[PDB]
Amino acid sequence: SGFRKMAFPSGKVEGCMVQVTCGTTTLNGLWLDDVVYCPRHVICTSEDMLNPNYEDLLIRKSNHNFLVQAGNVQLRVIGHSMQNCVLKLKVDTANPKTPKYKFVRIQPGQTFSVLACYNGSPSGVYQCAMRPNFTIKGSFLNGSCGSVGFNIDYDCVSFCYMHHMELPTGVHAGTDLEGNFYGPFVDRQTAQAAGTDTTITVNVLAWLYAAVINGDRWFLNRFTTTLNDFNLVAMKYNYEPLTQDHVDILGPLSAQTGIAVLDMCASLKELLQNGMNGRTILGSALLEDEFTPFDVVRQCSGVTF
Amino acid sequence: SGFRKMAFPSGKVEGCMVQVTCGTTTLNGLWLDDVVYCPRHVINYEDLLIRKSNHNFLVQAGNVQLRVIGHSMQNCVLKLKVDTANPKTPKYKFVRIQPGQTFSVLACYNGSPSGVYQCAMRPNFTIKGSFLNGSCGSVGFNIDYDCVSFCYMHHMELPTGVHAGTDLEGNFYGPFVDRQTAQAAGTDTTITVNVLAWLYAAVINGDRWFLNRFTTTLNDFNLVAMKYNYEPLTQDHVDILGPLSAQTGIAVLDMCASLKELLQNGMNGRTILGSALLEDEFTPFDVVRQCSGVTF
Ligand SMILES: CNC(=O)CN1Cc2ccc(Cl)cc2[C@@]2(CCN(c3cncc4ccccc34)C2=O)C1
Ligand SMILES: CNC(=O)CN1Cc2ccc(Cl)cc2[C@@]2(CCN(c3cncc4ccccc34)C2=O)C1
Ligand SMILES: [Cl-]
């Protein structure tokens, strides 16, 4: 019993964190095999950030301009290249602690664990989701750039995020491990803001099924809804449109609890209209959207209470 | 910016988790040096233990079987002497925590870690964790510099869905026993010093809507707090909140008057750090560490 925001064990990722220093800038890098991946803005000064020409800044660099530190040992850089917004530093030593890994690009609504680091040293681990506006509500301070987001499936670490910047509203933006940003953001100090955020409907529904699995049914009603009528109401509360794909993905949870997806949708409609009236669902006074249908199946029991 | 419930990096603890099987029971063990620590319920425990031999205990570390060469009991924990010392043993201490203090839990099943989360020892000595059958022997810990302080070992789930366990010396937190009997968690209270710390964290992150021009005496605050099932705030708590009071410029009794108004009038459609409830599972030190960048 119980339902907590759970992160993956971070050990396999801790063994990859290194410190990258280029001139006056110091941030984090991910050491996998003989390559260290880090944000390309490590070659930038604060002035350069306004309109940086990365290609022109990088051509002026040699290998020995980059200092890589793994624990107390200095790694020697023997090559360097740029791939989108990520800098790839070829080092002389392969990481003996390299896990089985993949680089995956996630979609909004997907969750992942973040290992927050400063000076190549991990300080904390937390779970979060890629928001519909492509930002993450993280906890990052100056020096956390290069911190990574990941999932662990069996013994394989799937790297999905590298931290690059903080937006004016306090949210965070970054890239996949191939250097492609999530969202319409640039690694430039431009007037850029996160788009209006929305609630991840499929995730809220999954968490309502998790509450039913843990023995909470007070929010259920005798009503059903069409998918179209649900979306007209949901849009009014800044909820993401629920697609047929989302309904298909919610199938196993509907079968396990015996509550059809469109009947759970009718409960959500009523929850939005009424609020909770002094009640909580899984110890929360708000509707939680950072647990996917796959997270609920992973954490919750196969037997409903 | 941002404020999340953050756990310590679990790597140093992952390298210690093993699977312990004794007959029909399979739970988790903590392998430190040549000893494996696990709940004694894996087996009148003195009479049950005398009937067991070393080879009855099956210990698995990854894909390798560890050979048990000795066994002893210390309170509610079983200590299995094994043939191999753990090469991944970190610098460690066994510490007993007090209610209100927080820690990270590495939840395991079959000696394999599956997740990490942060939680607090409730005033009623239970933890609101996320544990399924097979999670017994999962451990709670803090990291300070390079030393892992083990503070909790999971034993059981109570009828309300909350969890109970021991320190690493086998002494239970709370009035619980390790057996099938009628036991329930006592009435719980809110950890006031922790709620105050989290209000200071909201001010640090730019949220001041809840502040007012008022102050309160410590006694008047406690009379109000006692009515909302809040733990009494002591002078020690006020002293511990000193650094956060100095950093934000808001006196502890000034922040207490903001909490008093939130308790009597609610939030009124407003949230604090994305929460519609007053959060009590961040200590004053957790707030300072998350808003400073302390690494391990
Ligand atoms: C908040 N931004 C700034 O003050 C200036 N920043 C412009 C800027 C523009 C583009 C890019 Cl790709 C990087 C950056 C910086 C690099 C570091 N960084 C940060 C990252 N994470 C969390 C932070 C928390 C506090 C302060 C800075 C943080 C940035 O946003 C710097
Ligand atoms: C809920 N408990 C029971 O039904 C009976 N339980 C008696 C019992 C008596 C003494 C002791 Cl020291 C342990 C125990 C059990 C052993 C495992 N365990 C559990 C622990 N965590 C999470 C669980 C989730 C679901 C079911 C069991 C869980 C217990 O409390 C089992
Ligand atoms: Cl995805």
Side-chain angles (χ1 to χ4, degrees):
Chain A
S1 179
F3 205 72
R4 282 255 183 215
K5 204 160 277 163
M6 212 168 285
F8 281 101
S10 58
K12 284 166 170 70
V13 179
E14 291 168 51
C16 302
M17 304 304 311
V18 302
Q19 190 204 77
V20 185
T21 302
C22 193
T24 198
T25 312
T26 294
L27 46 62
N28 308 280
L30 182 71
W31 181 28
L32 293 169
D33 299 305
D34 63 345
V35 179
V36 169
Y37 302 82
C38 77
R40 73 184 176 167
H41 73 84
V42 72
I43 75 185
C44 295
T45 74
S46 275
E47 187 173 284
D48 290 315
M49 295 309 300
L50 283 169
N51 285 296
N53 190 317
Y54 291 98
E55 297 93 359
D56 184 63
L57 292 164
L58 194 58
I59 198 79
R60 302 169 191 269
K61 308 228 132 202
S62 75
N63 297 329
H64 64 274
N65 293 151
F66 297 99
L67 310 179
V68 177
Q69 228 196 288
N72 253 103
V73 182
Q74 213 76 27
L75 298 180
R76 198 171 61 91
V77 171
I78 57 168
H80 63 276
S81 80
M82 187 169 55
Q83 179 179 6
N84 304 305
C85 305
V86 290
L87 179 55
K88 302 194 275 189
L89 301 172
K90 203 80 167 158
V91 294
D92 225 36
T93 310
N95 190 359
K97 295 178 180 166
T98 303
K100 256 217 66 187
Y101 79 94
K102 301 166 169 193
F103 283 171
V104 176
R105 187 178 172 90
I106 59 159
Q107 303 296 320
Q110 186 59 267
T111 66
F112 58 101
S113 307
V114 177
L115 182 63
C117 307
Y118 299 93
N119 297 291
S121 188
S123 67
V125 63
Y126 59 92
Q127 186 75 357
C128 71
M130 174 61 58
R131 299 307 306 169
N133 66 2
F134 295 98
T135 71
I136 75 168
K137 292 172 173 181
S139 181
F140 288 122
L141 297 184
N142 190 55
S144 62
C145 288
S147 293
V148 292
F150 65 95
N151 288 280
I152 304 179
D153 305 287
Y154 319 105
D155 234 36
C156 195
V157 181
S158 289
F159 293 105
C160 62
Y161 179 86
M162 173 168 281
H163 182 57
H164 279 64
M165 63 175 195
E166 186 175 287
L167 296 173
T169 53
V171 296
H172 306 92
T175 69
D176 58 27
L177 271 289
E178 301 187 340
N180 303 112
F181 260 96
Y182 285 99
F185 306 114
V186 289
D187 53 351
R188 191 183 160 208
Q189 209 173 295
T190 221
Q192 44 183 347
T196 301
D197 202 27
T198 49
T199 299
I200 308 152
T201 317
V202 65
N203 283 12
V204 173
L205 287 174
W207 170 87
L208 289 176
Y209 277 116
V212 173
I213 287 164
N214 276 252
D216 236 329
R217 305 176 46 99
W218 68 260
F219 48 85
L220 303 179
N221 64 15
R222 61 187 226 278
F223 304 102
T224 192
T225 185
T226 72
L227 182 61
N228 201 35
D229 280 352
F230 172 74
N231 289 328
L232 286 165
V233 174
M235 262 70 137
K236 295 160 191 195
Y237 294 94
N238 265 45
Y239 263 60
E240 271 299 288
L242 192 80
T243 68
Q244 182 54 221
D245 265 17
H246 293 150
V247 182
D248 294 344
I249 288 173
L250 288 166
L253 290 170
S254 168
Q256 183 190 333
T257 66
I259 303 161
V261 180
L262 295 172
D263 289 5
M264 194 58 90
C265 285
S267 298
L268 183 52
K269 272 166 74 178
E270 186 165 284
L271 274 174
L272 299 174
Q273 156 188 283
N274 293 349
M276 302 211 199
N277 194 19
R279 296 175 293 233
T280 58
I281 299 167
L282 295 167
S284 188
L286 291 183
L287 297 174
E288 290 241 49
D289 71 355
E290 301 213 349
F291 294 106
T292 69
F294 191 100
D295 289 341
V296 169
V297 166
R298 193 171 186 271
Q299 180 173 181
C300 293
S301 177
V303 189
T304 295
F305 171 51
Chain B
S1 260
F3 206 69
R4 285 255 174 208
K5 205 160 277 162
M6 212 171 283
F8 281 103
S10 56
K12 285 163 164 69
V13 177
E14 289 168 53
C16 305
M17 309 303 310
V18 298
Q19 189 204 77
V20 184
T21 302
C22 194
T24 202
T25 302
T26 295
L27 49 66
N28 310 281
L30 184 71
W31 180 30
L32 293 170
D33 298 304
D34 63 346
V35 178
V36 169
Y37 302 82
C38 78
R40 75 183 175 169
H41 71 84
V42 73
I43 75 185
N44 192 319
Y45 285 112
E46 169 187 339
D47 181 60
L48 291 166
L49 193 56
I50 56 100
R51 303 167 192 256
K52 303 257 179 181
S53 72
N54 298 327
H55 266 353
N56 280 154
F57 298 99
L58 310 179
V59 178
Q60 273 213 229
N63 253 105
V64 183
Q65 213 76 25
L66 299 179
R67 177 199 171 101
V68 172
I69 57 169
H71 63 276
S72 81
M73 189 171 284
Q74 179 178 6
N75 304 305
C76 304
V77 145
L78 179 54
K79 303 193 275 189
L80 301 171
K81 203 79 167 158
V82 294
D83 63 353
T84 310
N86 190 359
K88 294 174 175 187
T89 307
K91 261 216 62 182
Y92 80 93
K93 296 158 174 129
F94 283 170
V95 312
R96 188 177 172 91
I97 60 159
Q98 303 296 320
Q101 293 182 309
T102 58
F103 58 100
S104 296
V105 178
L106 181 65
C108 309
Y109 299 93
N110 299 294
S112 189
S114 68
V116 64
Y117 60 91
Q118 185 76 358
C119 69
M121 174 60 61
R122 299 307 306 168
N124 73 359
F125 295 100
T126 70
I127 75 168
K128 295 170 173 182
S130 184
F131 288 121
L132 296 184
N133 191 54
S135 56
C136 293
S138 293
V139 292
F141 64 96
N142 288 281
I143 306 172
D144 308 289
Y145 306 102
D146 62 341
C147 174
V148 175
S149 289
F150 293 106
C151 64
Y152 179 86
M153 173 169 280
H154 182 59
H155 283 64
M156 63 177 197
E157 186 177 286
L158 296 174
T160 55
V162 299
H163 305 106
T166 68
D167 58 27
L168 269 290
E169 300 186 341
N171 309 289
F172 260 96
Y173 285 99
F176 305 115
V177 293
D178 54 349
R179 40 185 262 256
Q180 181 86 85
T181 196
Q183 41 186 349
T187 295
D188 202 25
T189 49
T190 299
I191 310 152
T192 318
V193 65
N194 284 14
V195 173
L196 287 173
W198 170 85
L199 288 177
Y200 277 116
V203 173
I204 287 164
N205 276 256
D207 236 327
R208 307 172 72 92
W209 68 261
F210 49 57
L211 303 177
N212 63 16
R213 65 166 59 238
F214 306 106
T215 193
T216 183
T217 72
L218 184 59
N219 201 34
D220 280 353
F221 173 74
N222 287 329
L223 286 165
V224 171
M226 212 199 315
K227 160 196 165 199
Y228 293 94
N229 265 47
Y230 263 60
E231 273 298 289
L233 193 79
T234 70
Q235 183 52 26
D236 195 33
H237 293 151
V238 182
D239 294 344
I240 288 161
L241 288 166
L244 291 169
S245 174
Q247 182 189 334
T248 65
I250 303 162
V252 179
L253 295 171
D254 185 1
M255 193 58 91
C256 284
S258 296
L259 183 52
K260 189 215 287 97
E261 301 315 311
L262 296 173
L263 289 177
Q264 301 162 321
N265 308 308
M267 300 213 200
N268 306 354
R270 281 174 301 187
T271 63
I272 301 167
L273 295 166
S275 190
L277 292 179
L278 297 176
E279 172 79 53
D280 70 356
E281 301 214 351
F282 293 104
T283 69
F285 300 85
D286 290 340
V287 171
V288 167
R289 199 166 306 121
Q290 182 158 180
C291 307
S292 78
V294 167
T295 66
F296 314 93

